[PDB]
Amino acid sequence: ATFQFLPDEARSLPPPKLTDPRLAFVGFLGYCSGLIDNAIRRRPVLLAGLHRQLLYITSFVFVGYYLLKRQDYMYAVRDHDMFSYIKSHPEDFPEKDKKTYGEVFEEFHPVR
């Protein structure tokens, strides 16, 4: 599509798990923003405004979830494009015949 965040084809891919380690890190970043908010305003860093701290985490997780989906979609699209091109141009990607090390000659460089 054009100017679409998550085109319709992206729904074939599995969704990111809610226990994604990257999503947990994003949630952690949101928690840190909550603490720095208290610190710059000289509130008790850990206890002040738990309602505010809850929205910092939630906001980061919510936005982080969709950015993770787009990220995974774009890499899937990259792989999908690359394999199609290889399929359509077999002459540029020949299956070379591999030799064994008993057959291949490698120079020996003594360490002495």
């Binding site: 990257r22 890190f25 923003s33 720095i36 710059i40 000289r42 910092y56 990220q71 774009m74 890499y75």
Partner: protein
């Protein structure tokens, strides 16, 4: 300024940029730049002093000259292709003019002389718009015309900007001039990678905007515009010195901070294209920037400068400036490296 008028003028600045980014017609791109410039002058003038008047005048002449060159490129393109579509240009002479016009708008060296002076002459909040939002429109055009850009010209502009930005910042004690030369150096990295991978231009642009917005916001929170004024922050807001320390080290590209990611990803793209000397030269030259960021950290955070007696009065009053989005911006300015693969969202 009336608060309603200020909002309307700010939206006109944004609308001028948006028109540039959604237009498929060169005339509408030119209109976007004209609209944007028209609305940015009042916010540079909003404190009515001779230095503000000088800055706005120097800004007007530079941007007006660039917009004339942009229109000249558009008409030459029309002569040789008979169309107005925003894309590659169809004449080498038009490409050079458009590239130079956009370099003038961005403030890249050697069209850089206005950026330190205009930034110094306008308030911190205006400087924040000048060095962040105003880069979006010229960069979005460069993103679309890069196939027709002369490679030697664009890389020469990039190398000179990294050199000029690095050397210029060493002699500065004014915080707005330091930011201005930091901007010039960072535009250089963005345009060096443009011929190879435009996505890394966008990545560097976004990360640069976040860190620059962080620094300007923290300067505004304390009303600091000089190195020595900033050296008093330890005896008022100790937390702010730590945030300033981390952000400056990030802007210096030190791992494992977010500001390493754009330099790292750009080096990767140019090496993939068998470009080794240029990335190596750029990385070494960027140590000049790291030096005068480190100097600020020394006077702000890692040492305690002398204070004044009247500072004790400030201890009794809370910090009442908005500091909007600062907790979010500072965290993104420093802690995003583990999420680097997310740069593909920009693809």
């Amino acid at each position: 300024m009336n608060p309603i008028i200020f909002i309307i003028i700010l939206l006109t600045i944004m609308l001028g940029t948006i028109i540039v980014m959604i237009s498929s017609h060169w005339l509408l791109v030119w209109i976007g730049f004209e609209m944007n410039m028209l609305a940015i002058i009042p916010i540079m003038m909003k404190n009515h002093n001779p230095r503000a008047t000088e800055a706005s005048t120097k800004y007007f002449l530079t941007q007006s000259t660039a917009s004339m060159l942009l229109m000249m490129a558009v008409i030459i393109n029309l002569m040789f292709s008979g169309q107005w579509t925003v894309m590659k240009l169809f004449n080498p002479m038009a490409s050079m003019l458009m590239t130079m016009a956009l370099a003038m708008k961005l403030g890249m060296a050697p069209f850089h002389f206005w950026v330190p002076e205009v930034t110094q002459g306008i308030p911190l909040s205006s400087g924040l718009i000048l060095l962040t939002w105003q880069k979006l429109a010229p960069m979005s055009v460069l993103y679309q015309i890069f196939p027709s850009i002369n490679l030697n010209l664009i890389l020469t502009l990039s190398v000179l900007s990294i050199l000029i930005g690095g050397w210029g910042g060493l002699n500065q004690t004014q915080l707005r001039k330091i930011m201005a030369y930091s901007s010039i150096a960072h535009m250089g990295w963005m345009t060096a990678v443009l011929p190879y991978n435009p996505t890394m231009t966008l990545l560097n642009l976004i990360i640069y905007i976040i860190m620059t917005s962080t620094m300007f916001t923290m300067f505004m929170a304390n009303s600091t515009t000089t190195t020595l004024s900033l050296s008093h922050t330890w005896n008022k807001t100790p937390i702010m010195t730590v945030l300033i320390l981390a952000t400056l080290l990030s802007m210096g590209g030190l791992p494992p901070l977010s500001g390493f990611m754009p330099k790292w990803m750009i080096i990767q793209e140019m090496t993939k294209n068998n470009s080794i000397i240029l990335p190596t030269f750029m990385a070494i030259t960027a140590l000049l920037n790291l030096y005068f960021y480190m100097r600020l950290t020394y006077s702000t955070t890692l040492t305690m400068f002398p204070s004044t007696n009247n500072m004790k009065m400030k201890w009794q009053f809370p910090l009442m400036k908005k500091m909007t989005f600062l907790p979010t911006m500072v965290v993104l300015s420093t802690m995003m490296l583990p999420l680097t693969p997310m740069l593909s969202v920009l693809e």
